[PDB]
Amino acid sequence: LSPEQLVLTLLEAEPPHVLISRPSAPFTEASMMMSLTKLADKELVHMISWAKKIPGFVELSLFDQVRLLESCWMEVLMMGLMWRSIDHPGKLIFAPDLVLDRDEGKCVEGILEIFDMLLATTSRFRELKLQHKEYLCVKAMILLNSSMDSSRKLAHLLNAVTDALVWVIAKSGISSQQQSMRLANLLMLLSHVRHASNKGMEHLLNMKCKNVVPVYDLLLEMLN
């Protein structure tokens, strides 16, 4: 599969937007948490479908597939979230009808912090002028690099997507030196995405213990 074909495959595999309606009254810790948990659950289902579309993923051992997804699901969700918010400075586009403002993160204990960093990282991507095709490759790399011979095949899968990302950046026309710098700049942000993802799940776990909102079936399994 050529780099372009891989990108095209990823493009089509992009999950459709999950539609979730903003609560009637002003958000309360409960209503907002109800909103983000229900949304996350819905996107997770779509994420699984997306994973199966990544070339070679379904060839990996089931246990590796599970391991990878359990390891980076929140990272994948936030990467998509930031991409959805890329053209809406100051705003976090969780869903078409669920556009959360930085200030709205106050009704929830400790989420403001997380919103801040999500927005900050999103701005960085904005500053770098991240392109859709680069986004597609990066999001897949997040999944394949969460390695946290099936493993042999994994390395090869990850290199394929990496090859595809190089191809996309090469197509931008910038000099070879600049292509390398851009590639580095893009990947160095994955730490930031991961940091927010860590805080996000630590927050979700804590909220679960607090009963602040129900969480169990799909989200519960992933959380664990």
Binding site: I48, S49, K52, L62, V66, E70, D217, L218, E221
Partner: peptide
């Protein structure tokens, strides 16, 4: 189950 189901059953 949920995860495993979606990965192999769906």
């Amino acid at each position: 189950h949920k995860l495993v189901q979606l990965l192999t059953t769906t």
